[PDB]
């Protein structure tokens with residue numbers, strides 16, 4: 001199933017929100033940059049106890065390359081969630097069963113050294129003038145789309 | 155070539171928290187909703203709203219419909235050919251995975267605490283729910299709205 005990697009995300013509100021969404025959709029694991037975030041009050045406000053029920057794993061940003069390489073060997077497709085020239089449109093993207101979603105930092109997105117390690121980048125198409133979506137919302141949309149496709153395939 | 159007029163209406167009048175309203179404002183702008191309806195335009199004056207909306211309020215039409223005026227507003231939109239879709243977990247809700255959105259869709263989101271009140275459930279044409287797998291009872295209301303806005307958008311793009 002689905003691994004969501006939030007190690008690049010800085011804000012406890014985004015992490016806490018994502019924790020709730022991952023739990024609701026039955027993600028296999030949510031990966032965070034520091035287990036300390038789980039006990040942050042802003043995180044807890046948004047996660048509404050989801051952390052009790054969702055597997056959580058710490059992978060610090062410096063360890064991401066090695067972690068993602070290991071997941072490839074286990075049969076995961078490493079999917080960057082990002083707006084890039086080479087990104088595939090989410091409306092056109094059929095998820096592999098073993099999908100891993102890498103979310104970007106709120107300010108910096110996914111850095112070039114990590115883009116290089118990805119199997120694919122997937123982009124949510126936009127119609128308005130605002131540059132991008134919130135990172136938690138972005139992750140929610142891909143988590144949902146993966147889930148929708150899997151429910152329909154099964 | 156050519157950008158179609160947006161039919162999608164998102165109604166957030168029942169939502170209380172400025173963080174949810176601001177987040178939803180950004181999402182609605184990004185996906186080109188025709189309008190975001192709010193319970194009070196006071197919300198856009200709030201720093202918490204502004205932090206999350208990232209100026210989207212400058213580009214997305216906002217209209218105020220106070221909750222006591224909601225029934226009249228929804229009735230007028232039916233007259234204009236809108237399907238009034240409650241976004242809510244109920245025994246008669248249609249599963250989002252099986253729901254085909256009409257072009258003129260209006261999404262009514264519930265209050266964070268109270269959901270959609272009974273007097274408004276009466277006014278709905280249909281209720282739509284996002285299926286869940288885990289233990290937690292519900293999604294955040296802005297995230298719920300984002301998922302329906304996305305599914306509406308995906309469906310319209312495929313046709």
Ligand SMILES: Nc1ncnc2c1ncn2[C@@H]1O[C@H](CSCC[C@H](N)C(=O)O)[C@@H](O)[C@H]1O
Nearest residue numbers: 081082103104106109123124132133135138
């Ligand atoms: N339309 C979209 N498609 C895919 N990811 C998106 C997205 N909008 C926001 N994101 C996600 O949210 C993160 C923070 S947004 C910051 C970078 C953004 N691409 C920019 O140039 O402004 C991104 O790194 C990505 O993971």
Ligand SMILES: Nc1ncnc2c1ncn2[C@@H]1O[C@H](CSCC[C@H](N)C(=O)O)[C@@H](O)[C@H]1O
Nearest residue numbers: 241242263264266269283284292293295298
């Ligand atoms: N799975 C889901 N499907 C559809 N709407 C949902 C949803 N999860 C949350 N929502 C939306 O988010 C709002 C706040 S959740 C409101 C309280 C919730 N009914 C409870 O019992 O705890 C709802 O009114 C609805 O509009």
